[PDB]
Amino acid sequence: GVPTYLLPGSGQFLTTDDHSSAPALPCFNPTPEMHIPGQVRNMLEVVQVE
Amino acid sequence: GVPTYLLPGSGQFLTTDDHSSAPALPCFNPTPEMHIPGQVRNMLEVVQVESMMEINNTESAVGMERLKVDISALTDVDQLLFNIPLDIQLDGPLRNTLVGNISRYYTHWSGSLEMTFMFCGSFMAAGKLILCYTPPGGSCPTTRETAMLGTHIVWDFGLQSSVTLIIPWISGSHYRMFNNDAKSTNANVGYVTCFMQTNLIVPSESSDTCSLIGFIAAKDDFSLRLMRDSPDIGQLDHLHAAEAAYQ
Amino acid sequence: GVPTYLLPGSGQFLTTDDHSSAPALPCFNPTPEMHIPGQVRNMLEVVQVESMMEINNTESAVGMERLKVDISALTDVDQLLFNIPLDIQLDGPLRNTLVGNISRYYTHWSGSLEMTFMFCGSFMAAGKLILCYTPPGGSCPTTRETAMLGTHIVWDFGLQSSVTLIIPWISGSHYRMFNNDAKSTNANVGYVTCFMQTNLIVPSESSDTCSLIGFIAAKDDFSLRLMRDSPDIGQLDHLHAAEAAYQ
Amino acid sequence: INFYKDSYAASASKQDFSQDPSKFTEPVVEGLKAGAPVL
Amino acid sequence: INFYKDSYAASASKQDFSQDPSKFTEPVVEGLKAGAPVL
Amino acid sequence: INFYKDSYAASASKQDFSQDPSKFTEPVVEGLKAGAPVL
Amino acid sequence: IESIIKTATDTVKSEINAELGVVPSLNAVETGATSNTEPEEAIQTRTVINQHGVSETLVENFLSRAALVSKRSFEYKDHTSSTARADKNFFKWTINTRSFVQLRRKLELFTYLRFDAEITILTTVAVNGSGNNTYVGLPDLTLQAMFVPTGALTPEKQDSFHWQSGSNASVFFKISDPPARITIPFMCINSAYSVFYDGFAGFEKNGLYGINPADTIGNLCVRIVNEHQPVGFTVTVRVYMKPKHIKAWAPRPPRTLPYMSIANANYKGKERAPNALSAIIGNRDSVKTMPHNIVN
Amino acid sequence: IESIIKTATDTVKSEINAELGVVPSLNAVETGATSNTEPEEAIQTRTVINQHGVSETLVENFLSRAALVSKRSFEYKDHTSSTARADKNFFKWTINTRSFVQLRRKLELFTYLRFDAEITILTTVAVNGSGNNTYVGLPDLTLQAMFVPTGALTPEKQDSFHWQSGSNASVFFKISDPPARITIPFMCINSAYSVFYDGFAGFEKNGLYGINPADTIGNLCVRIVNEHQPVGFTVTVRVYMKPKHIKAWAPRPPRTLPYMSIANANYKGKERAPNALSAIIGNRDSVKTMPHNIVN
Amino acid sequence: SDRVLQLKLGNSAIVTQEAANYCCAYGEWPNYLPDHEAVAIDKPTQPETATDRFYTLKSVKWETGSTGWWWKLPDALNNIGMFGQNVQHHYLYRSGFLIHVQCNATKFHQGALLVVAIPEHQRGAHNTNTSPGFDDIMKGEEGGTFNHPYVLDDGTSLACATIFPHQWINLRTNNSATIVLPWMNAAPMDFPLRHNQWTLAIIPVVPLGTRTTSSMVPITVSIAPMCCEFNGLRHAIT
After folding, report:
1. Which domain of life is it from (chains D, E, F) (predicted)?
2. What is the DSSP letter of G100?
3. Helix or strand holding residue G39 (H, E)
4. Among C223, G107, G191, G207, which lies 20 to 30 A Cα-Cα from B91?
5. What are phi and psi for residue I129, nearest 5 degrees?
């Protein structure tokens, strides 16, 4: 066994956290990506339009 | 000690998880593997085998009679014989097939199908049929002049007693999904219709009614997604002798 | 901190688990190892030693008399002397043996057995026997003409006072399992029978009844699986002086 | 992640993409060519 | 830290700094030079 | 996985497949050959 | 022949075909082979690069899902005056996969199966209404689950000495803990389990048809370790099984009629279609009637 | 001679044998050797490649199973008016392996044993029925388990100062925690434990036969750290032991008759067979009677 | 070319001029048990030509109300010739099969028979919780008939029976079917008197019909064991 201890914040649900989670559907193959006009990757691109 | 913290989802039991677990019997040696004929490693192999359709799913057909379609000699030309609905995720002639049964374990399906018809008349029986696949959008054609405008094959009876109509994958989307709405644009595949091309002509000493047997299978471009519990089986109570397992 | 999550089975106590645990006494130095004769590292070594069978398990036999079989001079030919049942996982002559006792700690067994019979008559006693192993499927043979059709060895008394009948592993499956059904196809091994080949002939001054001693052992192709609690020991209450350990 | 001493304790193996549908679809001693009359 | 067998189970990907605002701000067939009268 | 300082704290050792059944089955000063009369 | 398939096959474009002696659309079903007519030979097609995955239909993925195989409820209380049939703080269950139909049908889609079984045990507790009409709280109880080989001695009471488990594998778990999980190896005496057995497993004629004890994993004996509380509770234990490391042989026609018993494949069917004995598929008016015809 | 054996031995095919002077089926039991007749020399055999493993019969695997060695129940309450014999919120147990027969018989299958002992402690609690006829809930109590060497000073009460444990190893554990686990090393003054002792461990003639204190691991003193609650409870402590790193010498005949005491090997046997003094094996009608003969 | 076929085993030969190829179950051919898969250590007996030969069963009559026929292997051959003698004298059996089904008629006749080999066809009973008895399962040479061929007498579907090795006898196309079956069992060998590896089922999906003068149209089954081996010699059980 690996000796461990729990830190403050253990078990909390933070809405802005960034962690991997269990896949609900294993071996699922998503639909292949198709090129779509007008891709936006940063909202600063939108604010530059008058 | 290693500083750690627990994440959301800790301690949950997910039925589709993939983790190692403690071996109950240590040092157990399983029985050595022996070669067994007919190994299957992908259920798409099973759906490629053709199985009989229940085209004659009418109240007048009992049991095995539901697995064949009777054709007789007609005195009018361009007459319709039968039609087959489209959905493999819905109840119908395609449901109780290998491809249909396996596909009803999933929610999304894609790929081309093949429908094989075997003529089971006498050797002296002659005839020409036309089998048409109609892409969705309108009503099922009721006349040959409208059905021949879609995909079709003209079948001539002869030494080769079987013909194949390919239903190609003609869909706007990559996959077709299952809902309880047969008329959705994401579920409807079209129709299949059979018409007489010329007639069924037999001599006086041959049977005047001849049976066709229809099979359906999927091609190698077929695929399934979003596994779900099959609606083809269920229980409202415990089975018999299930209590005896606790005795 | 290291982000972690708990899996199903966390905190459980499994009696067959294999994990390191905290040492209660740090820096403890165990006594140096000394060579001791008779080290055993696998229980299959113990089952290879032959142990006496209780063939004479009858109400008329008390204690040690259950470990020998008496043979006398007969006036009819081809007469049966005794039979031995098959199962090492069931109560019988083979149960209270090293191989039987060790095998009853497991559920599955495989491999060939060997049965060794020692003649304990006088030097002037002569005789010929036949020992037959019959594979399962039918009844135990009651006549020599039926028993000799299976596996057998003809034993002639002489300077070598012991004979060995090998019961080879003849099974459809890799292993034979234990259930409480002696007649199952996964448990039945066959029968052993002993018949007189010619007769037992002794002079007037020798004992007219001579004793055979039967031993059974396993060969090196023997193996056991699925360890289980032995049915040969149990308790319905606490033992004597067990309470004194708490005083 | 498998720290157990028994190999059967490991997770599921979903990396076997080998197929042979012919053993179910074409179990005939003599193969059939495309377009040629089978019978 | 992603020990799952499915790639979609991983954490969010916040490392895509590629931009092209012109497709929203200058969707014209002929580009415009600085200072020159556009019309 | 053994992070303890004492060696006896480790898990069970199930990797000893060495055997010598003869010390229990043939504890005789003179060995016996196959088929030859032992006595 | 054997090949590695990770995606659906691509489509190649095709042209007009007017070749004499070539009839790709004609087949011979009587040989038992499946039609080999390609879409390229039936119609005129375009070039399509197919990137659709096939990993979700893998037999491992298709079967390696935790499915409920046992559900047993029993009363945790003082059982001095209880009947003989009642489960007195403990129960024993012969492990089988034929009690719940969703997993049973999927397993019966094949003739031979070889897999290890991951077992998950989930425990729930409620306060018994009768007697204790008031709710006082749920106790965190310790449960012992002992694996006993088929036919071996099972405990006869909650405090039986057989629970000492000298060699039997036992797992102790709390209700407040996550569900207990173990892995039972592939333990058949043969190289694979027999999903269907066309024979009798006894050397006489009074045996059981279709039941091969070599295919029974064993017995699970579950007890409450804690002695009874002054009030009674109802404890429900759910056992889920997940096959893993699966090998499958000889796929079979799926079950159509509802199951009748866990001991055989007896069939009755529904009173009317669908899934009736005389009509598996629901009826329509005629073979010329489209059930869901689009009318605009 | 010594050899590494991982699988059962293969079988070689054999032919007809008609050699003079060669009698592989004849043996001499009087020498004390086990018969060496091979199946190849008794019958005609085929070639068999044996892949059956032998790892489950390893002595380590055979003995490294957690088995119940102690079970003690005591009342956690106010003990001012209790009797002297009652366990007042604490108990002391001399560690032994002879109280529960399933582990004792397996350990007595050998003459000499050397192993470290993994100790697991499982605690259960119930509300005492008498006095508190109503259930109020189970308290999460802290328990202290102190290892005291054989013959040393053990605590005399729950709040004894001996519990301070200056040098004695002590483990504190909650009921809501997983069962407490420690590892006691091989602590015999000799190179191995004596499972059987044919002698007396005292220099006079009034000692105890068969009891060697050098083979006693020690004493376990278990107390409830919490002071008593206004209501009484019943606390049951179960101690399980698992040998590990095991060396075994001189295997012995297994025990047949039921055990009588933990202090000796006294025997009485059952009233009738099986396992009776005059008849270990159950009787049959005669030596010519097959107990389970197949009759069709 | 593929319409004519001759099968020659032992001293038996069968010729057909209206065959439609033939089926090898799962693309496999019968073979003897190899050493690396063997369990029983005694030397097996391999009678070869004495047992690997065609045995012709009693013919059945194809009627208008026929529901189908079935035979169980090795049960159907357990009391025929040297194969039956070897089965009766040996505890363990192993072999494959070669099945040839014959049915001819006139060019004015119509009818389709599905000839399917089902591995481990565990039969269920209709409208009862009691399992089928020994006499319901073991019919021997005569075989049995299908109570509900629509569900294959086991709650499954006949429409999906094509997943099993099979052929069709269509009267306008062919008059015979041939299936080659390898050994199909979880164990390398088995006791031949209590377990059946294969079940041959002949089901008239399309009923026999004609308007000529009615004649008896029988169906004949010829089964040839292949690569027979037997273990555990003892007295005959019979």
Report:
1. Viruses
2. S
3. helix G39-42
4. G107
5. -90, -5
The token pair at B115 is 């429908």
Phi/psi for I150 (5° steps) reads -60, -30
Rg (CA), chain C: 24
Q: Count other Cβ atoms within 10 Å, centred on residue B104.
A: 22
Tokens, residue H92 = 């002391």
Architecture of domain C1-247: Sandwich (2.60)
Range of the domain at I212: 5-233
Q: Which of G1, G27, G31 to mutate to test the interface with I (most CBs of I within 10 A)?
A: G31
I25 vs F11: CA distance, rounded Å: 50
Tokens representing F38?
Answer: 């032992």
Name the strand (E) or helix (H) holding G114: strand G110-127
CB within 8 Å of C85: residues ≥ 6 apart: C92, C93, C94, C191, C192, H290, H291, H292
Per-residue burial over G254-291, b if 16 or more Cβ lie within 10 Å, else e, is bbbbbbbbbbbbbbbbeeebbbbbbbbbbbbeebeebb
What's at C169, amino acid-wise? W
In this complex, how many residue pairs, one in chain A and one in chain E, have their CB atoms less than 8 Å apart? 49
**Distance between CA atoms of G183 and H160, rounded to whole angstroms?**
46
Nearest CA in chain B to C13: B22
What does the longest C-alpha to C-alpha distance in chain C come to? 95
Identify the CA nearest to C162 among candidates C171, C153, C150, C170.
Answer: C153
Cα-based angle C175, G191, C89 (whole degrees, multiple of 5): 20
What residues form DSSP beta bridges with G209? Answer: G200
Q: Is the peptide bond before C168 cis (omega within 30 degrees of 0)?
A: no
| Annotated resolution, angstroms | 2.3
Total structural domains in chain F?
Answer: 1
Are the C-beta atoms of residues B200 and B72 closer than 8 Å to each other?
Answer: yes
Q: How far is CA B50 from CA C9, C83, I162, I165, in A?
A: 45, 58, 7, 12
What was the experiment behind these coordinates? cryo-EM
Neighbours of C54 (CB within 10 A): 22
Contact F14 D3 (CB under 8 A): no
Contact I150 G277 (CB under 8 A): yes
- CB-based touch D/I (3+ pairs, under 8 A): yes
F39 Cβ under 8 Å from any chain C Cβ = yes
- Which sequence spans correspond to the domains of chain B? 1-247
Instruction: Give the nearest chain F residue to A4 (CA atoms).
Output: F3
Comparing alpha-carbon positions, the chain F residue that sits nearest to C220 is F21
List CB contacts (< 8 A) between H238 and chain G: 225
Number of neighbouring beta carbons within 10 Å of residue I55: 18
CA dist G166 to G148, G170, H217, Å?
Answer: 12, 9, 20
Across the A:B interface, residue pairs with CB atoms under 8 Å apart total: 51
> Å from A13 to nearest chain B CA?
6
Residue among I98, I11, I83 nearest I47 (CA): I83
Check CB contact of D16 with chain E, cutoff 8 Å.
no
- From C61, C220, B4, G150, select the one nearest H8 (Cα to Cα): C220
